Amino acid sequence: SSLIKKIEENERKDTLNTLQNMFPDMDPSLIEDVCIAKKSRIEPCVDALLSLSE
């Protein structure tokens, strides 16, 4: 769970960074609401792959 959350955190943080740089005067929270999904697909997909590769 901690590894998966680190992985989700990595994708989120990286997306915001690229967007922040391109939209400097934009409130970061707005950028997040508009560009990042409420709930990540990482945990579900990783769980699915774990079951499929076992």
Side-chain angles (χ1 to χ4, degrees):
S1 188
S2 292
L3 228 201
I4 304 175
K5 291 191 291 184
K6 163 65 175 175
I7 293 172
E8 299 180 307
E9 176 206 308
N10 293 336
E11 65 160 51
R12 163 188 172 292
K13 171 178 176 291
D14 186 290
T15 293
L16 293 184
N17 264 59
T18 299
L19 291 177
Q20 236 89 140
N21 284 308
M22 292 176 294
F23 300 89
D25 316 305
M26 299 250 89
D27 175 309
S29 307
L30 173 60
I31 289 174
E32 187 163 358
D33 301 319
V34 175
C35 314
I36 299 176
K38 31 286 171 295
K39 314 224 173 183
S40 183
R41 182 165 177 161
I42 300 296
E43 171 167 84
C45 111
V46 165
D47 290 320
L49 294 181
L50 281 171
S51 292
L52 292 176
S53 62
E54 66 179 327

Coordinates of all heavy atoms in Angstrom, one line a residue:
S1 N 0.9 -1.2 0.0 CA 0.0 0.0 0.0 C 0.9 1.3 0.0 O 0.6 2.2 -0.7 CB -0.9 0.0 1.2 OG -1.9 1.1 1.2
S2 N 1.9 1.2 0.8 CA 2.8 2.4 0.9 C 3.6 2.5 -0.4 O 3.9 3.6 -0.9 CB 3.8 2.2 2.0 OG 3.1 2.3 3.3
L3 N 3.9 1.4 -1.1 CA 4.7 1.4 -2.3 C 3.7 1.9 -3.5 O 4.1 2.7 -4.3 CB 5.2 0.1 -2.7 CG 6.7 0.0 -3.1 CD1 6.8 -1.3 -3.9 CD2 7.1 1.2 -4.0
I4 N 2.5 1.5 -3.5 CA 1.5 1.9 -4.5 C 1.1 3.3 -4.3 O 0.9 4.0 -5.3 CB 0.2 1.0 -4.3 CG1 0.5 -0.5 -4.4 CG2 -0.8 1.4 -5.4 CD1 -0.7 -1.3 -4.1
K5 N 1.1 3.8 -3.1 CA 0.7 5.2 -2.8 C 1.9 6.1 -3.3 O 1.7 7.3 -3.6 CB 0.4 5.4 -1.4 CG -0.9 4.8 -0.9 CD -1.3 5.2 0.5 CE -0.4 4.7 1.6 NZ -0.9 5.1 2.9
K6 N 3.1 5.6 -3.2 CA 4.3 6.3 -3.6 C 4.3 6.4 -5.1 O 4.6 7.4 -5.7 CB 5.6 5.6 -3.2 CG 6.9 6.0 -3.9 CD 7.2 7.4 -3.5 CE 8.6 7.8 -4.1 NZ 9.0 9.2 -3.9
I7 N 3.9 5.3 -5.7 CA 3.8 5.2 -7.2 C 2.7 6.2 -7.7 O 2.9 6.9 -8.7 CB 3.4 3.8 -7.6 CG1 4.7 2.9 -7.3 CG2 3.1 3.8 -9.1 CD1 4.4 1.4 -7.6
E8 N 1.5 6.2 -7.0 CA 0.4 7.1 -7.4 C 0.9 8.6 -7.2 O 0.7 9.4 -8.0 CB -0.8 6.9 -6.6 CG -1.4 5.5 -6.7 CD -2.7 5.3 -5.9 OE1 -2.6 5.6 -4.7 OE2 -3.7 4.9 -6.4
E9 N 1.5 8.8 -6.1 CA 2.1 10.1 -5.7 C 3.1 10.6 -6.8 O 3.1 11.8 -7.1 CB 2.7 10.0 -4.3 CG 3.4 11.3 -3.9 CD 4.6 11.0 -2.9 OE1 4.3 10.3 -1.9 OE2 5.7 11.5 -3.1
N10 N 3.9 9.7 -7.3 CA 4.9 10.0 -8.3 C 4.2 10.5 -9.6 O 4.7 11.5 -10.2 CB 5.8 8.8 -8.7 CG 6.7 8.4 -7.5 OD1 7.0 9.2 -6.6 ND2 7.1 7.1 -7.6
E11 N 3.1 9.8 -10.0 CA 2.5 10.2 -11.3 C 1.7 11.5 -11.1 O 1.8 12.4 -12.0 CB 1.5 9.1 -11.7 CG 0.3 8.9 -10.8 CD -0.9 8.2 -11.5 OE1 -0.6 7.1 -12.1 OE2 -2.0 8.7 -11.4
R12 N 1.1 11.7 -10.0 CA 0.4 13.0 -9.7 C 1.4 14.1 -9.6 O 1.2 15.1 -10.4 CB -0.4 12.8 -8.3 CG -0.8 14.2 -7.8 CD -1.3 14.1 -6.4 NE -1.5 15.4 -5.8 CZ -0.5 16.3 -5.5 NH1 0.7 15.9 -5.7 NH2 -0.8 17.4 -5.0
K13 N 2.4 14.0 -8.8 CA 3.4 15.1 -8.6 C 4.0 15.5 -9.9 O 4.2 16.6 -10.2 CB 4.5 14.6 -7.6 CG 5.7 15.5 -7.5 CD 6.7 15.0 -6.5 CE 7.9 15.9 -6.5 NZ 8.8 15.8 -7.7
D14 N 4.4 14.5 -10.8 CA 5.0 14.7 -12.0 C 4.1 15.4 -13.0 O 4.5 16.3 -13.8 CB 5.5 13.5 -12.7 CG 6.3 13.7 -13.9 OD1 5.7 14.1 -14.9 OD2 7.6 13.5 -13.9
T15 N 2.8 15.1 -13.0 CA 1.8 15.7 -13.9 C 1.7 17.2 -13.5 O 1.7 18.1 -14.4 CB 0.5 15.0 -13.8 OG1 0.6 13.7 -14.4 CG2 -0.6 15.8 -14.6
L16 N 1.5 17.4 -12.2 CA 1.3 18.8 -11.7 C 2.6 19.7 -12.1 O 2.4 20.8 -12.5 CB 1.1 18.8 -10.2 CG -0.2 18.2 -9.7 CD1 -0.3 18.4 -8.2 CD2 -1.4 18.9 -10.4
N17 N 3.8 19.1 -11.9 CA 5.0 19.8 -12.2 C 5.0 20.3 -13.6 O 5.2 21.5 -13.9 CB 6.2 19.0 -12.0 CG 6.8 19.2 -10.6 OD1 6.2 19.0 -9.6 ND2 8.1 19.6 -10.6
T18 N 4.8 19.4 -14.6 CA 4.8 19.8 -16.0 C 3.7 20.9 -16.2 O 4.0 21.9 -16.9 CB 4.5 18.6 -16.9 OG1 5.5 17.6 -16.7 CG2 4.5 19.0 -18.4
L19 N 2.6 20.7 -15.7 CA 1.5 21.7 -15.8 C 1.8 23.0 -15.2 O 1.5 24.0 -15.7 CB 0.1 21.1 -15.4 CG -0.4 19.9 -16.2 CD1 -1.7 19.3 -15.6 CD2 -0.7 20.4 -17.6
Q20 N 2.3 22.9 -13.9 CA 2.7 24.1 -13.2 C 3.6 25.0 -14.0 O 3.4 26.2 -14.2 CB 3.4 23.7 -11.9 CG 2.8 24.3 -10.7 CD 1.8 23.3 -10.1 OE1 1.8 23.1 -8.9 NE2 1.0 22.7 -11.0
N21 N 4.6 24.4 -14.6 CA 5.6 25.1 -15.4 C 5.0 25.8 -16.6 O 5.3 26.9 -17.0 CB 6.7 24.1 -15.9 CG 7.7 23.8 -14.8 OD1 8.3 24.7 -14.2 ND2 8.0 22.5 -14.6
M22 N 4.0 25.1 -17.3 CA 3.3 25.7 -18.4 C 2.2 26.7 -18.0 O 1.8 27.6 -18.8 CB 2.7 24.6 -19.3 CG 3.8 23.8 -20.0 SD 3.0 22.3 -21.0 CE 2.3 21.3 -19.5
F23 N 1.7 26.6 -16.8 CA 0.7 27.6 -16.3 C 1.1 28.1 -14.9 O 0.4 27.8 -13.9 CB -0.7 26.9 -16.3 CG -1.1 26.4 -17.6 CD1 -0.7 25.1 -18.1 CD2 -1.9 27.2 -18.5 CE1 -1.1 24.7 -19.4 CE2 -2.2 26.8 -19.7 CZ -1.9 25.5 -20.2
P24 N 2.1 28.9 -14.9 CA 2.7 29.6 -13.7 C 1.8 30.4 -12.8 O 1.9 30.3 -11.6 CB 3.8 30.4 -14.2 CG 4.2 29.7 -15.5 CD 2.8 29.4 -16.1
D25 N 0.9 31.1 -13.4 CA 0.0 32.0 -12.6 C -1.3 31.3 -12.3 O -2.3 31.9 -11.8 CB -0.3 33.3 -13.4 CG 0.9 33.9 -14.0 OD1 1.9 34.1 -13.2 OD2 1.0 34.1 -15.2
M26 N -1.4 30.0 -12.5 CA -2.6 29.2 -12.2 C -2.5 28.6 -10.8 O -1.5 28.0 -10.4 CB -2.7 28.0 -13.2 CG -2.9 28.5 -14.6 SD -4.6 28.1 -15.2 CE -5.4 29.8 -14.7
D27 N -3.6 28.7 -10.1 CA -3.7 28.1 -8.7 C -3.4 26.6 -8.9 O -4.2 26.0 -9.7 CB -5.0 28.4 -8.1 CG -5.2 27.8 -6.8 OD1 -5.0 26.6 -6.6 OD2 -5.6 28.5 -5.8
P28 N -2.4 26.1 -8.2 CA -2.1 24.6 -8.3 C -3.3 23.7 -8.0 O -3.5 22.7 -8.6 CB -1.0 24.5 -7.3 CG -0.3 25.7 -7.4 CD -1.4 26.8 -7.4
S29 N -4.2 24.1 -7.1 CA -5.4 23.3 -6.7 C -6.3 23.2 -7.9 O -6.9 22.2 -8.1 CB -6.1 24.0 -5.5 OG -5.1 24.2 -4.4
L30 N -6.5 24.3 -8.6 CA -7.4 24.4 -9.8 C -6.8 23.4 -10.8 O -7.5 22.6 -11.4 CB -7.4 25.8 -10.4 CG -8.2 25.9 -11.7 CD1 -9.6 25.4 -11.5 CD2 -8.2 27.3 -12.2
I31 N -5.5 23.5 -11.1 CA -4.9 22.6 -12.0 C -5.1 21.2 -11.7 O -5.4 20.3 -12.6 CB -3.3 22.9 -12.1 CG1 -3.1 24.3 -12.7 CG2 -2.6 21.8 -12.9 CD1 -1.6 24.7 -12.7
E32 N -5.0 20.8 -10.4 CA -5.3 19.5 -9.9 C -6.7 19.0 -10.2 O -6.9 18.0 -10.8 CB -4.9 19.4 -8.5 CG -5.0 18.0 -7.9 CD -4.3 17.9 -6.5 OE1 -3.7 18.9 -6.1 OE2 -4.3 16.8 -6.0
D33 N -7.7 19.8 -9.8 CA -9.1 19.5 -10.0 C -9.4 19.3 -11.4 O -10.1 18.3 -11.8 CB -10.0 20.6 -9.5 CG -9.8 20.9 -8.0 OD1 -9.6 20.0 -7.2 OD2 -9.8 22.1 -7.6
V34 N -8.9 20.1 -12.3 CA -9.1 20.0 -13.7 C -8.4 18.9 -14.5 O -8.9 18.4 -15.4 CB -8.7 21.4 -14.4 CG1 -8.9 21.3 -15.9 CG2 -9.7 22.5 -13.9
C35 N -7.1 18.6 -14.1 CA -6.3 17.6 -14.8 C -6.1 16.3 -14.2 O -5.6 15.4 -14.9 CB -5.0 18.3 -15.1 SG -5.1 19.9 -15.8
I36 N -6.3 16.1 -12.9 CA -6.0 14.9 -12.2 C -7.3 14.2 -11.7 O -8.1 14.9 -11.1 CB -5.0 15.0 -11.1 CG1 -3.7 15.5 -11.7 CG2 -4.8 13.7 -10.4 CD1 -2.6 15.8 -10.6
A37 N -7.5 12.9 -12.0 CA -8.6 12.2 -11.6 C -8.8 12.1 -10.1 O -7.8 11.9 -9.4 CB -8.6 10.7 -12.2
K38 N -10.0 12.1 -9.7 CA -10.4 12.0 -8.3 C -9.7 10.8 -7.7 O -9.0 10.9 -6.7 CB -11.9 11.9 -8.1 CG -12.6 11.2 -9.3 CD -12.7 12.1 -10.5 CE -13.1 11.3 -11.8 NZ -12.2 10.3 -12.2
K39 N -9.9 9.7 -8.3 CA -9.3 8.4 -7.8 C -8.4 7.8 -8.9 O -8.8 7.6 -10.0 CB -10.4 7.4 -7.4 CG -11.4 8.1 -6.6 CD -11.9 7.3 -5.4 CE -12.8 8.0 -4.5 NZ -13.2 7.3 -3.2
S40 N -7.1 7.5 -8.5 CA -6.2 7.0 -9.5 C -6.5 5.6 -9.9 O -7.2 4.8 -9.3 CB -4.8 7.0 -8.8 OG -3.8 6.5 -9.7
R41 N -6.0 5.2 -11.1 CA -6.2 3.9 -11.7 C -5.1 2.9 -11.3 O -5.2 1.7 -11.6 CB -6.3 4.0 -13.2 CG -6.6 2.7 -13.9 CD -7.1 3.0 -15.3 NE -7.4 1.8 -16.1 CZ -8.1 1.8 -17.2 NH1 -8.7 2.9 -17.6 NH2 -8.3 0.6 -17.9
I42 N -4.0 3.5 -10.7 CA -2.8 2.7 -10.3 C -3.0 1.5 -9.4 O -2.6 0.4 -9.7 CB -1.8 3.6 -9.7 CG1 -1.4 4.7 -10.7 CG2 -0.5 2.8 -9.3 CD1 -0.6 4.2 -11.9
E43 N -3.7 1.7 -8.3 CA -4.0 0.7 -7.4 C -4.8 -0.5 -8.0 O -4.5 -1.6 -7.8 CB -4.6 1.2 -6.1 CG -5.1 0.1 -5.2 CD -5.5 0.7 -3.8 OE1 -6.7 1.2 -3.7 OE2 -4.6 0.7 -2.9
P44 N -5.9 -0.1 -8.7 CA -6.8 -1.1 -9.3 C -6.0 -1.9 -10.3 O -6.0 -3.2 -10.3 CB -7.9 -0.3 -9.9 CG -8.0 0.9 -9.0 CD -6.5 1.2 -8.7
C45 N -5.3 -1.2 -11.2 CA -4.5 -1.9 -12.3 C -3.4 -2.8 -11.7 O -3.2 -3.9 -12.2 CB -3.9 -0.8 -13.2 SG -2.2 -0.7 -13.1
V46 N -2.7 -2.3 -10.6 CA -1.7 -3.1 -10.0 C -2.3 -4.3 -9.4 O -1.7 -5.4 -9.4 CB -0.9 -2.3 -9.0 CG1 -0.1 -3.2 -8.1 CG2 0.1 -1.3 -9.7
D47 N -3.4 -4.2 -8.7 CA -4.1 -5.3 -8.1 C -4.5 -6.3 -9.2 O -4.2 -7.5 -9.0 CB -5.3 -4.9 -7.3 CG -5.0 -4.1 -6.1 OD1 -4.1 -4.5 -5.4 OD2 -5.8 -3.1 -5.8
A48 N -5.0 -5.9 -10.3 CA -5.4 -6.7 -11.4 C -4.2 -7.5 -11.9 O -4.2 -8.7 -12.1 CB -6.0 -5.9 -12.5
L49 N -3.1 -6.7 -12.2 CA -1.9 -7.4 -12.7 C -1.3 -8.4 -11.7 O -0.8 -9.4 -12.1 CB -0.8 -6.3 -13.0 CG -1.2 -5.4 -14.2 CD1 0.0 -4.5 -14.5 CD2 -1.5 -6.2 -15.5
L50 N -1.4 -8.1 -10.4 CA -0.9 -9.1 -9.4 C -1.6 -10.4 -9.6 O -1.0 -11.5 -9.6 CB -1.0 -8.5 -8.0 CG 0.1 -7.5 -7.6 CD1 -0.2 -6.8 -6.2 CD2 1.5 -8.2 -7.5
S51 N -3.0 -10.3 -9.7 CA -3.8 -11.5 -9.8 C -3.5 -12.2 -11.1 O -3.5 -13.5 -11.1 CB -5.3 -11.1 -9.7 OG -5.6 -10.7 -8.5
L52 N -3.3 -11.5 -12.2 CA -3.0 -12.1 -13.5 C -1.6 -12.7 -13.6 O -1.5 -13.6 -14.5 CB -3.2 -11.0 -14.6 CG -4.6 -10.5 -14.8 CD1 -4.6 -9.4 -15.8 CD2 -5.5 -11.6 -15.3
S53 N -0.7 -12.2 -12.9 CA 0.7 -12.7 -13.0 C 1.0 -13.8 -12.0 O 2.0 -14.5 -12.2 CB 1.7 -11.6 -12.9 OG 1.6 -11.0 -11.6
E54 N 0.2 -13.9 -11.0 CA 0.5 -15.0 -9.9 C 0.6 -16.4 -10.5 O -0.4 -17.1 -10.3 CB -0.6 -14.9 -8.8 CG -2.0 -15.2 -9.3 CD -3.0 -15.2 -8.1 OE1 -2.6 -15.4 -7.0 OE2 -4.2 -14.8 -8.4

